[PDB]
Design a protein around this ligand. Structure first.
Ligand code: 3PE
Ligand code: 3PE
Ligand code: 3PE
Ligand code: 3PE
Ligand code: 3PE
Ligand code: 3PE
Ligand code: PLC
Ligand code: PLC
Ligand code: PLC
Ligand code: PLC
Lengths: 506, 28, 169, 64, 205, 95, 491
């Protein structure tokens, strides 16, 4: 469905005239395509049938219940992202027209979704190299979609070079495995899992660790996420981690067959450093996207602890954590895009320059959100308290399940460190909450006729005009309550995670 | 005659806090 | 007058390292400005030798001027487009302070320990304190070169710091 | 107000300020900087794992 | 009669008396000292070539300055690491095994030896505080069981039958002490006297 | 990267050094030192000094400013407000 | 019929206040009638909600059996089992009683946003009350740390000048320490596959593992009582949080640590609790002695009250760790008595003096009995109650806790008797100064204690005297539940 509909959109977009309205309607067509793709995938793929694992296309691809769950998650999260570009986020032309300016926006997303879904399914070293480049190239194009932006082109240049080096490392690892064994199919390689250099697979993971911003390769990820536009950072900082982490879990599943203790220590060493940089790094920063980049690094480290353990509880921990983190990731960036309407207008010290690509760029731009919009502020507070890990929010159960897998497999040092890192990271998490609400009682009797929303003309002075459009506000409302009220259906959701099998069987 | 009680420091440096001779107000 | 030669040797040596390694431009501007001021010190203080105390006063004068400039810029705004002129003054003070502390002299803490007993005595032996002049009269401004290992300017500013703390009114 | 503040909010703030200042200088867009770190990580593969703690002590030494 | 104190220590594989062949402290420490010196010295010369390759490009210079080490650091680092390798192996041989106390001593002393080289322009007490901090971190590292408990984890114990998969039975009392991860319904009273002692309510009032 | 790194004291220090390479009347130059009276500069001598000061700080005085500047301090103020680093190639910054 | 009714009614109560106040927020520039008189009609509804919450537990109290061993009112809700025994029943009643008292304390002394404050207070009361009726470690931890989110915002919004520092202290001190308790809970769920109270009490773990579990749990508890040297957050929070926040924190939150010892340490880690008892006594004795001496040098009026709570809860920790029924009952009695006297001292200091003069420095106040006689009467009476004078519930709790400590350890447990002298030293020095000498030259004559402040003081004084004179109202409920926590093998 994806491939066939992508070709039609490519031709149609180049035929019709260039306009913002047609691009937005074409974006809605892409939304229907992903929705149709989800319906088709759910019709034929079931958890019970895929438990054993089914080979496809001359065994080049292998789909199981573990892989199928992530693919369904990828399609769903992509649907929520397209809603941002398929509908209004602020209702203001000066702000929203950026999303409708580039026609190939929906085309590049559909290219990347194909790469994202097929990556966990790779069963050959040749197709592994092909798919990882297909996903990587699509991310470079999306980072450079705004080619009139100096920062966007600079970030894409940085993204291309770092990813290309990682691709070379991935290619170098697969070639070294072929030299030792002469086989390209992973299942054939598993026959010689006890006779190949298991550190060559560590070289493969090193290339994958670069693509997810893991330490010591964290620096480029933070720089790219902060410079890129908020609409672009929202995608490139979450989507690559959905597929690569799933593939890392499969590779670590194969590595644990021989159970190389030296391999675990090296990965533990990188996880330990990533928790230090992830926690202390965000303590002294002024940009919100820079803060979220450190937050992204820290949370990936938590998931890697579950991946490194690679046990039955790890499947439950990883599947739950990746789902709830994605929903929190979408909710936070959705709120950030909307709340740009409450920015004061100058009418200066520090000569602060704010561009149309990132209207919200500093943490202190979130000031007085408790007064400007109490419901949106609480929704952000719930999301932030979830990242902290306050129970009974979705974030607590994610860390609760990760700790179970870590301590069950004997990672006492990492479990204690991850909890110290959580407390350290709470400092900058609480700073967001301090900016939102701690000055409410002093600024309650204040006058703000210079906000961006105040420039919006009224219709007839009698219509009750909402400040936010129907779609984006509903998505925030739905995601916020799912995070808040997870205790109601927590037991059944984990039971669903009980049935996700990666060749466990019995 | 009068003398200061015990444990009264001769000197202190609390940043820019003014430094004055310790005086027992009971003896005023 | 050899410590001044040793102290000036480091300043010139650091400039070569800054240029060779392409280090901070501001540090290069700091060092080149000190050598300009030090050039005046050579001309003006000729035939009177060059002790470290006159070098300490030379560096102290530079530090206070930039602090005075920074105190105005940080209040009224910087004139440059990027509003970095005020912060540049503060960053240059750190470089000069780095060379100021490298001089073989006593720190302000030791001088404060050698001046506070004098300040306390004046208050105790007179009842009330109104001006630092009464403290200056008891300062031996002839033997403070190896006993206190301080300069004229170093002692003068320290007494003012303690006088403000100890002023009754 | 003393040792419990050194081993508390005041001491941890000074520790956090020192550590976070170093990490702020490590984040800048530079191809040569990130390239060397990637190549440096290849030494972890080469080195025998019993040297990890020595690397850990070396890393802390550079923070100073 | 020693005092009855709690023992919050994770399980460790023990070697019986006569085992634990000692480690050659000199040879192990010399490999770290020589290896660290060649790499740190070798990279220093290589970075000098990068400076000469171009010195009019601010971007290259900024990253080179961060990785650059002073002469004292180029000397102090191999000595500190070499001293750490020697003391860690030397203290382990004395105790017939590696303990957090020995690693705390090995890390703190070696760090202080190194700190006295490349941190000369600092108070001695300042270097002692960092040495204590550095030593405590590696003592905590050994106490936690390095990066992984290995065969002392619950997963390893569960596979070996030392877990709690079979439930519990009060009618079966084991004279020997249970496993670290094993739970029981009822314990011998003699074991309680061993752990706590007679006194405040055990056996006697 | 592309930001001014000048200070009022450094700009004044280099301004004095440039002006001491000419045949000025007095070597004591400060912010309030006037070109016409204290330095004894005529029409062409003043313009020679202004262009020489332009070369030092890599700045260009506009026509209105150059035709109305009176004191050295005004030159110092102009340099601080208007100086910018010259844009480098793509390789100098990102590499 | 308890947790289901309590959560559903309060959730409906939260929704009701949100719908009414936030209906006209759509840039209407409106005036409305609910906001008249500082949102009186919205404060009144929230006050009624707190009162009804008390009636909910009273209906279940009628069916409570004091002669039945084990948990009663066992209920399944949200995939969680809930139950009540003797110890849980009394602590729930104390938490719900302080609900209306906390709301009434800030009736007309907030700068605005009363609806947000009312909802936050009621949410905290219910969350803390639910923490006494959960029947597993995971549910205990969820409610143990869920209160941080409403409390962090409450302090940061309605706090004093240093509210920002106080909000960071309470959020980080109580979370970084509770995470160490979560590690012990995770270990239980790994090796036993369950965290149920009854299930884990019957399991004997290795003496080394019990030591590790005890340390992880005690770190979360010791920070929350609090105990030295992890106590420095509490004086900052009390001196900056609003009066209603101080009442809940001093009256309920600090009692969760004592209840945590009952549930998480005594019945499941009994063998290691005996071994740790000398260490706990040494820490608590030093906490009691040091805090009393530190209180003598404090100048902030509300900080003095904050340190007084540390010394009293040190006695509670000493009593609850005694392996006899006298010490255990006395610790529970002292917790209930402290739950009334301690908020009253904050009301006198942070609610009466502060609401008039807005300065908490001690140098501004002396001779207050000249123009505030009603204030001085309550101040003196509550000062004697805080010092353990008989006829007050504090004396019954302190005497039995000291007696139980001596029975547990005659030599070092005798040092707990120093609380009789040390508590009177700092408490009376404050009261003697506030009432003695001439009226302060820095104060203007103003109103004495009003009717609203009289109501708060009287209905906090009444439970203290009733418990002090006839503590058998409390002992009868506790006797069967508390007897299960004793570990001894007499042969
Ligand atoms: C759009 C939401 C559609 C939900 C579809 C969930 C789904 O894909 O199926 C559940 C899937 C497992 O499905 P499976 O076991 O293979 O087959 C049985 C299906 N009954 O399990 C999964 O893998 C799904 C994992 C992702 C769960 C997403 C939960 C919903 C996300 C919030 C939706 C917000 C809706 C916002 C509405 C915007 C429009 C106004
Ligand atoms: C009772 C309640 C207790 C609660 C708290 C318990 C923990 C207490 C921790 C105590 C240690 C921190 C407090 C003292 C540190 C004070 C820092 C300081 O004074 O300055 C920073 C110092 C450099 O000193 P300087 O900047 O020049 O300051 C002037 C000093 N005269 O910079 C340094 O030299 C520091 C050494 C370099 C940095 C080392 C970092 C290595 C890792 C440290 C441990 C972090 C562990 C994090 C684990 C999770 C993340 C992995
Ligand atoms: C920097 C200095 C900080 C303190 C030095 C470390 C002190 C640690 C210690 O407690 O002493 C241990 C150490 C000897 O090492 P140890 O493991 O005890 O050898 C076995 C001897 N029976 O004793 C020392 O070597 C000292
Ligand atoms: C010999 C080759 C180079 C060494 C290997 C470096 C790469 C691997 C380290 C992983 C982290 C990558 C960080 C980025 C690479 C570091 C590059 C570097 O060396 O820059 C030095 C940097 C700046 O130092 P600065 O003094 O400000 O500048 C010198 C001017 N003369 O100084 C720094 O701040 C860099 C240190 C970053 C902080 C990393 C901390 C990692 C965690 C350590 C503690 C572990 C936490 C757990 C502790 C308990 C464990 C039981
Ligand atoms: C009328 C239709 C309402 C829904 C009816 C229903 O079946 O929902 C289930 C439950 C009713 O109860 P029941 O089915 O008998 O089983 C007990 C499970 N609570 O009803 C419910 O469970 C609804 C509960 C909603 C309130 C839960 C919100 C949690 C509050 C925060 C957690 C605090 C404690 C941790
Ligand atoms: C405001 C005041 C607050 C309180 C202030 C402090 C007072 C409380 C603490 C002081 C001790 C109270 C009384 C404890 C002693 C009572 C026990 C006793 O009778 O003493 C003798 C007894 C030995 O009995 P015996 O029969 O001889 O033993 C034979 C063993 N085969 O047992 C003994 O051997 C005596 C034990 C040693 C003495 C301990 C007393 C020193 C405590 C110092 C505390 C710090 C100051
Ligand atoms: C307010 C801040 C509070 C800080 C915490 C205070 C805790 C106090 C605990 C002291 C315990 C103690 O002193 O124990 C005493 C034991 C000695 O016993 P032993 O020699 O093995 O046997 C004794 C047998 N005799 C009598 C026959 C010789 O010492 C230790 O082994 C100390 C180990 C831990 C040190 C830390
Ligand atoms: C609190 C824990 C106290 C343990 C004391 C200890 O472990 O003692 C200190 C140990 C020495 O123990 P050792 O020499 O390895 O063994 C002892 C001798 N044996 C082999 C006969 C048993 O060294 C250290 O300083 C280690 C660093 C302590 C870090 C503690 C972190 C706890 C985090 C919270 C966990 C829930
Ligand atoms: C027991 C389960 C309860 C969970 C749900 C509780 C309600 C959530 C808020 C939705 C309604 C809303 O945001 O409405 C806002 C309300 C009403 O305040 P107001 O003064 O009228 O608003 C101002 C508008 N004015 C000025 C025009 C009058 O205030 C609240 O935020 C109170 C409830 C939240 C307290 C705790 C926040 C952090 C929660 C973290 C969870 C871990
Ligand atoms: C095991 C029991 C653990 C108990 C809790 C541990 C200590 C908590 C300290 C509170 C910090 C706070 O409140 O963060 C806020 C403070 C603000 O500092 P401030 O008060 O404004 O003064 C300082 C500011 N100045 C100088 C401008 C006046 O920022 C910090 O310090 C940031 C670092 C906090 C990291 C905490 C991580 C703890 C890791 C887990 C334990 C090893």
């Amino acid at each position: 469905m994806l491939f066939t509909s992508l070709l039609l959109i490519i031709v149609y977009g180049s035929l019709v005239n260039k306009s913002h309205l047609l691009t937005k309607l074409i974006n809605r067509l892409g939304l229907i395509i992903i929705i149709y793709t989800l319906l088709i995938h759910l019709n034929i793929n079931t958890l019970e049938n895929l438990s054993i694992g089914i080979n496809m296309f001359n065994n080049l691809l292998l789909i199981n219940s573990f892989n199928n769950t992530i693919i369904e998650l990828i399609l769903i999260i992509c649907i929520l992202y397209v809603l941002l570009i398929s509908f209004n986020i602020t209702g203001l032309s000066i702000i929203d027209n950026l999303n409708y300016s580039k026609r190939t926006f929906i085309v590049i997303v559909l290219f990347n979704i194909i790469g994202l879904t097929l990556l966990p399914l790779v069963n050959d070293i040749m197709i592994l190299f092909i798919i990882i480049e297909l996903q990587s190239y699509s991310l470079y194009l999306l980072t450079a979609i705004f080619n009139e932006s100096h920062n966007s082109t600079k970030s894409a240049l940085y993204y291309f070079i770092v990813g290309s080096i990682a691709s070379f490392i991935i290619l170098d690892a697969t070639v070294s495995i072929y030299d030792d064994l002469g086989l390209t199919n992973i299942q054939y390689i598993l026959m010689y899992i006890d006779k190949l250099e298991i550190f060559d697979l560590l070289c493969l993971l090193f290339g994958l660790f670069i693509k997810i911003g893991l330490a010591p390769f964290y620096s480029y990820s933070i720089t790219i996420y902060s410079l890129s536009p908020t609409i672009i950072t929202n995608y490139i900082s979450l989507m690559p981690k959905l597929s690569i982490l799933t593939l890392i879990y499969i590779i670590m599943h194969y590595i644990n067959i021989v159970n190389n203790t030296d391999l675990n220590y090296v990965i533990s060493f990188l996880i330990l450093i990533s928790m230090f940089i992830g926690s202390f790094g965000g303590l002294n920063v002024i940009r919100i996207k820079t803060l979220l980049a450190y937050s992204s690094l820290l949370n990936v480290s938590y998931m890697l602890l579950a991946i490194l353990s690679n046990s039955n509880e790890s499947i439950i921990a990883y599947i739950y954590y990746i789902i709830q983190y994605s929903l929190t990731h979408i909710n936070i960036f959705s709120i950030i895009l909307v709340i740009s309407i409450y920015l004061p207008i100058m009418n200066n010290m520090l000569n602060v320059m704010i561009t149309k690509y990132s209207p919200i760029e500093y943490i202190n731009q979130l000031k007085n959100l408790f007064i400007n919009n109490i419901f949106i502020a609480i929704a952000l507070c719930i999301s932030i308290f979830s990242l902290i890990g306050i129970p009974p929010l979705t974030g607590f159960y994610g860390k609760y399940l990760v700790l179970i897998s870590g301590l069950n497999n004997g990672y006492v040092l990492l479990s204690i460190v991850l909890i110290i890192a959580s407390s350290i990271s709470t400092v900058y998490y609480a700073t967001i909450l301090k900016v939102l609400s701690f000055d409410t009682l002093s600024f309650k009797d204040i006058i703000s006729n210079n906000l961006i929303i105040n420039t919006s003309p009224e219709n007839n002075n009698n219509e009750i005009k909402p400040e936010i459009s129907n779609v984006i506000s509903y998505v925030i409302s739905s995601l916020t309550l799912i995070i808040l009220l997870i205790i109601i259906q927590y037991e059944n959701i984990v039971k669903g995670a009980y049935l996700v099998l990666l060749y466990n069987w019995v | 005659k009068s003398f200061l009680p015990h444990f009264i420091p001769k000197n202190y440096s609390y940043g820019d806090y003014p430094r004055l001779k310790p005086e027992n107000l009971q003896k005023r | 007058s050899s410590a001044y030669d040793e102290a000036l040797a480091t300043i010139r040596n650091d400039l070569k390292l800054n240029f060779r390694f392409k280090a901070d431009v501001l540090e290069k501007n700091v060092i080149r400005s000190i050598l300009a001021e030090t050039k005046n010190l050579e001309i003006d203080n000729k035939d009177k030798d060059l002790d470290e105390f006159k070098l300490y006063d030379l560096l102290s004068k530079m530090i206070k001027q930039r602090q005075d400039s920074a105190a105005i810029y940080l209040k009224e705004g910087s004139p440059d487009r990027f509003r970095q002129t005020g912060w540049n003054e503060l960053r240059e003070v750190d470089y000069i302070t780095k060379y100021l502390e490298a001089l073989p002299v006593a720190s302000a803490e030791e001088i404060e320990a050698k001046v506070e007993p004098i300040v306390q005595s004046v208050l105790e032996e007179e009842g009330e304190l109104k001006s630092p002049k009464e403290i200056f009269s008891r300062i031996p401004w002839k033997v403070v070169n190896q006993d206190w290992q301080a300069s004229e300017g170093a002692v003068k500013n320290t007494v003012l710091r303690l006088y403000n703390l100890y002023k009754t009114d | 107000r003393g040792i419990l503040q050194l081993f508390g909010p005041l001491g941890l703030w000074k520790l956090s300020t020192f550590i976070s200042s170093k990490l702020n200088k490590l984040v800048f867009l530079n191809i040569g900087f990130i390239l060397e770190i990637i190549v440096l990580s290849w030494l972890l593969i080469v080195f025998k794992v019993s040297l990890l703690k020595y690397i850990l002590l070396l890393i802390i030494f550079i923070i100073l | 009669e020693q005092f009855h104190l709690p023992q919050p220590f994770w399980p460790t594989t023990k070697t019986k008396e006569g085992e634990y062949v000692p480690k050659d402290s000199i040879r192990e420490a010399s490999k770290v000292f020589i290896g660290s010196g060649v790499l740190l010295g070798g990279m220093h010369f290589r970075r000098l070539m990068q400076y000469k390759k171009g010195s009019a490009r601010p971007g290259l210079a900024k990253y080179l300055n961060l990785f650059s080490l002073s002469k004292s650091q180029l000397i102090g680092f191999p000595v500190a690491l070499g001293a750490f390798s020697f003391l860690s192996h030397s203290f382990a041989n004395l105790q017939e095994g590696q303990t957090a106390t020995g690693e705390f001593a090995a890390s703190s002393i070696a760090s202080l030896i190194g700190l006295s080289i490349f941190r000369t322009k600092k108070p001695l007490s300042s270097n002692v505080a960092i040495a204590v901090g550095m030593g405590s971190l590696f003592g905590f590292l050994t106490w936690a069981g390095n990066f992984n408990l290995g065969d002392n984890s619950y997963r390893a114990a569960l596979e070996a039958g030392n877990g709690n998969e079979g439930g519990f039975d009060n009618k079966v009392i084991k004279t020997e002490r249970q496993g670290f991860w094993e739970g029981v319904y009822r314990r011998p009273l003699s074991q309680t006297v061993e752990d706590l002692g007679e006194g405040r309510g055990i056996i006697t009032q | 990267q592309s930001a001014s790194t000048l200070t009022k004291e450094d700009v004044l220090t280099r301004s004095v050094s440039v002006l001491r390479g000419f045949e000025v009347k007095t070597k004591d130059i400060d912010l309030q030192t006037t070109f016409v009276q204290d330095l004894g500069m005529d029409s062409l001598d003043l313009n020679d000094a202004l262009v020489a000061l332009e070369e030092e700080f890599d700045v260009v005085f506009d026509d209105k400013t150059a035709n109305e500047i009176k004191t050295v301090g005004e030159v110092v103020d102009f340099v601080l407000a208007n100086y910018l680093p010259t844009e480098q190639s793509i390789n100098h910054t990102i590499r | 019929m308890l947790v289901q009714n309590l959560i559903i009614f309060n959730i409906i109560g939260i929704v009701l206040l949100v719908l009414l106040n936030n209906n006209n927020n759509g840039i209407l520039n409106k005036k409305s009638l609910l906001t008249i008189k500082n949102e009186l009609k919205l404060k009144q509804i929230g006050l009624i909600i707190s009162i009804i919450n008390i009636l909910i537990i009273i209906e279940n109290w009628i069916g409570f059996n004091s002669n039945y061993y084990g948990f009663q009112n066992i209920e399944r809700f949200l995939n969680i089992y809930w139950g009540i025994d003797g110890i849980s029943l009394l602590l729930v009643l104390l938490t719900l009683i302080l609900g209306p008292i906390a709301i009434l304390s800030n009736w007309k002394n907030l700068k605005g946003y009363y609806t947000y404050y009312v909802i936050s207070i009621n949410m905290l009361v219910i969350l803390m009350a639910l923490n006494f009726i959960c029947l597993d470690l995971v549910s205990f931890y969820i409610l143990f740390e869920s209160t941080l989110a409403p409390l962090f915002l409450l302090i940061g919004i309605y706090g004093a000048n240093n509210k920002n520092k106080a909000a960071y202290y309470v959020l980080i001190y109580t979370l970084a320490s509770s995470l160490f308790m979560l590690l012990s809970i995770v270990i239980y769920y790994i090796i036993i596959n369950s965290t149920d109270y009854i299930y884990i009490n019957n399991i004997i773990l290795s003496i080394n593992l019990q030591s590790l579990l005890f340390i992880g749990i005690i770190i979360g508890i010791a920070v929350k009582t609090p105990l030295m040297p992890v106590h420095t957050w509490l004086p900052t929070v009390h001196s900056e949080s609003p009066l209603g926040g101080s009442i809940l924190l001093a009256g309920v939150i600090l009692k969760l640590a004592i209840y945590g010892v009952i549930r998480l340490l005594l019945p499941n880690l009994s063998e290691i609790s005996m071994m740790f008892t000398p260490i706990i006594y040494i820490i608590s004795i030093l906490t009691l002695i040091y805090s009393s001496l530190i209180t003598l040098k404090q100048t902030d009026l509300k900080v003095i009250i904050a340190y007084s709570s540390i010394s009293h809860l040190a006695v509670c920790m000493i009593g609850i760790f005694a392996n006899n029924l006298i010490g255990i009952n006395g610790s529970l009695i002292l917790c209930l008595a402290h739950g009334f006297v301690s908020p009253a001292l904050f009301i006198l200091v942070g609610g009466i003096l502060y609401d008039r003069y807005h300065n908490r420095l001690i140098n501004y106040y002396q001779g207050l009995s000249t123009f505030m006689p009603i204030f001085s009467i309550y101040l003196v009476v509550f000062s004697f109650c805080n010092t353990g004078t008989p006829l007050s519930g504090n004396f019954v709790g302190e005497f039995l806790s000291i007696t139980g400590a001596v029975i547990r350890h005659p030599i070092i447990g005798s040092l707990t008797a120093a609380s009789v002298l040390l508590s009177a030293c700092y408490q009376m020095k404050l009261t003697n100064r506030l009432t003695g000498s001439v009226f302060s030259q820095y104060l203007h004559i103003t109103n004495d204690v009003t009717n609203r402040e009289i109501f708060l003081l009287n209905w906090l004084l009444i439970p203290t005297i009733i418990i002090g004179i006839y503590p058998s109202f409390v002992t009868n409920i506790l006797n069967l539940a508390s007897s299960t926590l004793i570990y001894s093998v007499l042969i």
